[PDB]
Amino acid sequence: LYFQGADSCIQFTRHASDVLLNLNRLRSRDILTDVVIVVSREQFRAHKTVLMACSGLFYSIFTDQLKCNLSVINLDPEINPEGFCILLDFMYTSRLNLREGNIMAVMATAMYLQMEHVVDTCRKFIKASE
Numbered sequence: 001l002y003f004q005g006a007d008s009c010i011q012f013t014r015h016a017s018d019v020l021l022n023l024n025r026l027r028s029r030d031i032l033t034d035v036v037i038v039v040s041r042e043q044f045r046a047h048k049t050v051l052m053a054c055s056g057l058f059y060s061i062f063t064d065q066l067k068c069n070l071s072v073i074n075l076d077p078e079i080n081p082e083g084f085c086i087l088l089d090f091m092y093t094s095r096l097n098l099r100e101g102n103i104m105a106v107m108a109t110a111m112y113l114q115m116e117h118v119v120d121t122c123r124k125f126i127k128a129s130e
């Protein structure tokens with residue numbers, strides 16, 4: 001459906017989430033992926049534009065005239081790959097699968113990737129356990 005937005009335009013309620021859904025479908029089928037992210041010898045294929053849109057670290061890398069052409073990016077080998085996988089799924093879905101058993105790895109990975117809204121959110125959930 002659609003509605004009249006604050007600017008008097010027609011606004012499509014599901015458009016942004018539908019675009020993201022379609023980008024995730026492309027990722028799952030490996031269509032137009034243009035980078036591999038390597039974490040602890042695990043490989044993750046993705047779209048650079050989605051990475052940049054969600055992460056300060058990826059934004060900096062892919063706006064750098066030298067690094068923007070790399071098709072393989074290695075992360076710190078101490079990064080937990082499940083932490084990365086969770087954040088990558090978040091990027092492509094808006095859904096963050098936080099659990100007691102993964103929250104610290106997810107928070108550390110989000111800090112490394114410069115995903116500040118995710119970092120803040122992990123803080124509140126940790127602080128509520130205390």
Ligand SMILES: Nc1ncc(Cl)c(Nc2ccccc2)n1
Pocket residue numbers: 022023025026
């Ligand atoms: N199912 C699917 N998966 C991925 C993409 Cl990118 C896509 N795009 C698209 C297809 C038809 C009409 C409008 C958009 N559709």
